[PDB]
Design an enzyme around this catalytic site. Structure first.
Site, PDB file in Angstrom:
ATOM      1  N   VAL B 150     -54.876 -63.128  51.765  1.00 57.38           N
ATOM      2  CA  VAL B 150     -54.317 -62.343  50.652  1.00 57.38           C
ATOM      3  C   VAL B 150     -55.393 -61.657  49.795  1.00 57.38           C
ATOM      4  O   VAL B 150     -55.115 -60.658  49.116  1.00 57.38           O
ATOM      5  CB  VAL B 150     -53.459 -63.231  49.737  1.00 57.38           C
ATOM      6  CG1 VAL B 150     -54.341 -64.152  48.891  1.00 57.38           C
ATOM      7  CG2 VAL B 150     -52.573 -62.379  48.827  1.00 57.38           C
ATOM      8  N   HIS B 171     -64.909 -61.216  63.421  1.00 59.83           N
ATOM      9  CA  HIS B 171     -65.390 -61.532  62.085  1.00 59.83           C
ATOM     10  C   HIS B 171     -66.556 -60.591  61.758  1.00 59.83           C
ATOM     11  O   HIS B 171     -67.465 -60.380  62.588  1.00 59.83           O
ATOM     12  CB  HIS B 171     -65.851 -62.996  62.056  1.00 59.83           C
ATOM     13  CG  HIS B 171     -66.220 -63.504  60.699  1.00 59.83           C
ATOM     14  ND1 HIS B 171     -67.294 -63.020  59.978  1.00 59.83           N
ATOM     15  CD2 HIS B 171     -65.683 -64.501  59.953  1.00 59.83           C
ATOM     16  CE1 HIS B 171     -67.382 -63.678  58.832  1.00 59.83           C
ATOM     17  NE2 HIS B 171     -66.423 -64.587  58.796  1.00 59.83           N
ATOM     18  N   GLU B 241     -60.483 -71.637  60.684  1.00 59.48           N
ATOM     19  CA  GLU B 241     -61.190 -70.637  61.483  1.00 59.48           C
ATOM     20  C   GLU B 241     -61.906 -71.297  62.664  1.00 59.48           C
ATOM     21  O   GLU B 241     -61.977 -70.731  63.756  1.00 59.48           O
ATOM     22  CB  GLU B 241     -62.172 -69.871  60.606  1.00 59.48           C
ATOM     23  CG  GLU B 241     -63.072 -68.877  61.311  1.00 59.48           C
ATOM     24  CD  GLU B 241     -63.828 -68.041  60.306  1.00 59.48           C
ATOM     25  OE1 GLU B 241     -63.223 -67.053  59.831  1.00 59.48           O
ATOM     26  OE2 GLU B 241     -65.001 -68.389  59.976  1.00 59.48           O
TER      27      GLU B 241
HETATM   28  O1  UDP Z   1     -56.238 -71.752  46.371  1.00 60.36           O
HETATM   29  C1  UDP Z   1     -56.019 -71.083  47.402  1.00 60.36           C
HETATM   30  C2  UDP Z   1     -56.911 -71.086  48.487  1.00 60.36           C
HETATM   31  C3  UDP Z   1     -56.599 -70.369  49.654  1.00 60.36           C
HETATM   32  N1  UDP Z   1     -55.491 -69.563  49.675  1.00 60.36           N
HETATM   33  C4  UDP Z   1     -55.144 -68.752  50.870  1.00 60.36           C
HETATM   34  O2  UDP Z   1     -56.028 -69.055  51.945  1.00 60.36           O
HETATM   35  C5  UDP Z   1     -56.740 -67.889  52.313  1.00 60.36           C
HETATM   36  C6  UDP Z   1     -58.165 -68.212  52.783  1.00 60.36           C
HETATM   37  O3  UDP Z   1     -58.943 -68.554  51.657  1.00 60.36           O
HETATM   38  P1  UDP Z   1     -60.110 -67.613  51.130  1.00 60.36           P
HETATM   39  O4  UDP Z   1     -59.628 -66.213  51.082  1.00 60.36           O
HETATM   40  O5  UDP Z   1     -60.621 -68.071  49.808  1.00 60.36           O
HETATM   41  O6  UDP Z   1     -61.224 -67.813  52.291  1.00 60.36           O
HETATM   42  P2  UDP Z   1     -62.492 -66.852  52.456  1.00 60.36           P
HETATM   43  O7  UDP Z   1     -62.107 -65.465  52.816  1.00 60.36           O
HETATM   44  O8  UDP Z   1     -63.284 -66.791  51.201  1.00 60.36           O
HETATM   45  O9  UDP Z   1     -63.238 -67.437  53.600  1.00 60.36           O
HETATM   46  C7  UDP Z   1     -56.668 -66.985  51.090  1.00 60.36           C
HETATM   47  O10 UDP Z   1     -56.760 -65.614  51.392  1.00 60.36           O
HETATM   48  C8  UDP Z   1     -55.294 -67.282  50.557  1.00 60.36           C
HETATM   49  O11 UDP Z   1     -54.359 -66.529  51.318  1.00 60.36           O
HETATM   50  C9  UDP Z   1     -54.614 -69.560  48.603  1.00 60.36           C
HETATM   51  O12 UDP Z   1     -53.592 -68.879  48.664  1.00 60.36           O
HETATM   52  N2  UDP Z   1     -54.870 -70.312  47.471  1.00 60.36           N
END
Ligand code: UDP
Ligand code: UDP
Ligand code: MN
Ligand code: MN
Lengths: 284, 284
Positions: B150, B171, B241
């Site tokens: 998101v 990635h 991942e």
């Molecule tokens: O407190 C949280 C942590 C994670 N997410 C969801 O899990 C996804 C992956 O986490 P994040 O984007 O922080 O990972 P990153 O891109 O930093 O690796 C987010 O995009 C959110 O959709 C969320 O909704 N609330």
């Protein structure tokens, strides 16, 4: 699909193309199969795990029975080795089919059919006959069908890299040609008509295939189109191949095979762009 | 398929690759999707003729509800426009979902779910939650599922060129890296373990998808693997991942999306190899 086992092979490199001299994907995202584009070990694993059975149809009508021995013996050396294969030999002379020794998991059926006087009609009627036998037999007996000319021999690997719901093969005479030069049927009176501003490739009538369902649909459609043309007093310039081209223009193939898969060395030599000559014309 | 209509577009040139600077097909003959490799008019025709409905899942748990407005507004501009779309927003705060105006044929459903304390659990439990709702709803409601982070915005076209039974996305941090450098789980005690001598690509947990059946399989499998890990007292180095990467190593995706589809312009700029930046990180 079930999981593949651990395999060790060279890592694909995102910033290093396998081939830079040729188009390896169509604009509808279907792979164009050239040597260097595929790791046959991964593909064999994928298809073996699904216990894939491949049907190969070939017509040997009248004098063309003479081509069967070399066609079949070379098929044994090169075609789908390691996979289940079912050859279907369509002929007006069952007794003239040579006794060729087959590898394990491979079988041959002889389908007795009528001969037509004109070679054009023999060639064209393959569509009707393949379509008919899809219903009679192929749907129950095999997963994919590969439909080829008999006046040919295998010289190198032809394997599961070709398998897909629907494939056509680039005709060796036109792979480098502009669409205006393609010998599509050009008379609007014919069901095979393609105007000069349309067309992706010129596919060869001598090598097409796909899932049984898709080949049934293709051959049925081509046959019906030929019957309409007949009623309209027209025969397409290149007979079944013209109709094959019209079908595949409007129903895009999910793989396209390079001319490695359909070649004539006498007529065309061995260009640098062909790393392998897999399935080639026998002088006739 | 049903026939495509007559279409006029430039001829694909067999002896002229669209992209010579990048790998456009995997060794298992799956397209790698880059700008220039596809004609979107052909693809739109193919998918519209099938009345394709695309589900898009996104999790906005706890503080991440903040990202929804931009995510949804930009999705409306760039994601599958012209096709049927069903957004599924998973959240612990249904009341916090911003009201976003949707184009015709597009719908949004809010799915209320539990919020885990640990961000790692929030991220990892998406697999269980997607798998559960595949049964609950997705199977009957959509043909394909696209599962994304998101904390992102759409900046350019993301369309039916991505649709296929199973896809992963390169990635952005590793597309040019050797497999030894990939941050796979390296501990053999973990179900997500991949040895230094294995690996095709490093796929991003932030963008994967496929047919509902294939996404259900992937998400179920990854959740199961995570539960086994939990029972064994280990958590994979990069959480969901890591498991996604294990899954796609053993179950090859039928398309791979280029990093156009998953980028961070702040960290990585806008390299020449990226002709479009389609779906990009929002600072946080
Ligand atoms: O407190 C949280 C942590 C994670 N997410 C969801 O899990 C996804 C992956 O986490 P994040 O984007 O922080 O990972 P990153 O891109 O930093 O690796 C987010 O995009 C959110 O959709 C969320 O909704 N609330
Ligand atoms: O008398 C004939 C004419 C044609 N064929 C079949 O029809 C195919 C196509 O004919 P041909 O190979 O002569 O066409 P060409 O390759 O010259 O275009 C042949 O391979 C045979 O399989 C046949 O069996 N007997
Ligand atoms: Mn021939
Ligand atoms: Mn994120």
């Amino acid at each position: 699909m079930v999981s593949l086992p651990r395999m060790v092979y060279p890592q694909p490199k995102v910033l290093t193309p396998c081939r830079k001299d040729v188009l390896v994907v169509t604009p509808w995202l279907a792979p164009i199969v050239w040597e260097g584009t595929f790791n046959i070990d991964i593909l064999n694993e994928q298809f073996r795990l699904q216990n894939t059975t491949i049907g190969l149809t070939v017509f040997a009508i009248k004098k063309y029975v003479a081509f069967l021995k070399l066609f079949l013996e070379t098929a044994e050396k090169h075609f789908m080795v390691g996979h289940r294969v079912h050859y279907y030999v369509f002929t007006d002379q069952p007794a003239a089919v040579p006794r060729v020794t087959l590898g394990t998991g491979r079988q041959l059926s002889v389908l007795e059919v009528r001969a037509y006087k004109r070679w054009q009609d023999v060639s064209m009627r393959r569509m009707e006959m393949i379509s008919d036998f899809c219903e009679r037999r192929f749907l129950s007996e095999v997963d994919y069908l590969v439909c080829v000319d008999v006046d040919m021999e295998f010289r190198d690997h032809v394997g599961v890299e070709i398998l897909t719901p629907l494939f056509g093969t680039l005709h060796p005479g036109f792979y480098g040609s502009s669409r205006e030069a393609f010998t599509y049927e050009r008379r609007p009176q014919s069901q095979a008509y393609i105007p000069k501003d349309e067309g992706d490739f010129y596919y060869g009538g001598a090598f097409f295939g796909g899932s049984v369902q898709e080949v049934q649909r293709l051959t049925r459609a081509c046959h019906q189109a030929m019957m309409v043309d007949q009623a309209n007093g027209i025969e397409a310039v290149w007979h079944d191949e013209s109709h094959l081209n019209k079908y595949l223009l409007r129903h895009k193939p999910t793989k396209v095979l390079s001319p490695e898969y359909l070649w004539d060395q006498q007529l065309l030599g061995w260009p640098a762009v062909l790393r392998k000559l897999r399935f080639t014309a026998v002088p006739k």
